[PDB]
Write a protein that binds this ligand. Structure first.
Ligand SMILES: COc1ccc2c(c1)c(C(=O)Nc1cc(C(=O)O)cc(-c3cnn(C)c3)c1F)cn2C(C)=O
Length: 131
């Protein structure tokens, strides 16, 4: 959760601007696209986890707030984010759920780490420009 330390405007205080959905798409969709471009690493993250399909019925005992790339895409596509930090926190939620649910020595854990590396590189300059 180190990103809470930077861009303190998103952490708290009074409203200084209204982000329009188009503004957020233009700034943020490229960072999401960067994750989708990771093949094979994005494949476990392009749809919500389906416990019955994947044989992991305990999934929702562990992960209370599921998230995935397609949901994040949809929220950007339909204007459901009011501010950029909400998008960033959903990306981190997706990664944190995967790292929580999966052992370190499983494929999905490894793929999560790769995607997290890619995201950090793409997002940092973007969030500076929006803060
Ligand atoms: C069996 O144990 C687990 C445990 C956690 C998993 C997954 C599996 C997982 C996953 O396998 N997602 C997934 C889902 C689907 C789907 O159709 O819903 C498809 C793939 C997939 C697509 N192509 N490939 C090679 C794999 C895919 F990787 C995604 N997970 C997450 C994000 O935690």
């Amino acid at each position: 959760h180190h990103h809470h330390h930077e861009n303190l405007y998103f952490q708290g205080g009074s409203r200084k601007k209204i982000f329009k959905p188009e503004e957020l798409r233009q700034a943020l969709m490229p960072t999401l696209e960067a994750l989708y471009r990771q093949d094979p690493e994005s494949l476990p993250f392009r749809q919500p986890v389906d416990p019955q399909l994947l044989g992991i019925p305990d999934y929702f005992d562990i992960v209370k707030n599921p998230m995935d790339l397609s949901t994040i895409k949809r929220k950007l596509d339909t204007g459901q984010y009011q501010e950029p930090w909400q998008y960033v926190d959903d990306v981190w939620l997706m990664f944190n759920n995967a790292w929580l649910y999966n052992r370190k020595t499983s494929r999905v854990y490894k793929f999560c780490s790769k995607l997290a590396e890619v995201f950090e590189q793409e997002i940092d300059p973007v969030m500076q420009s929006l803060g």
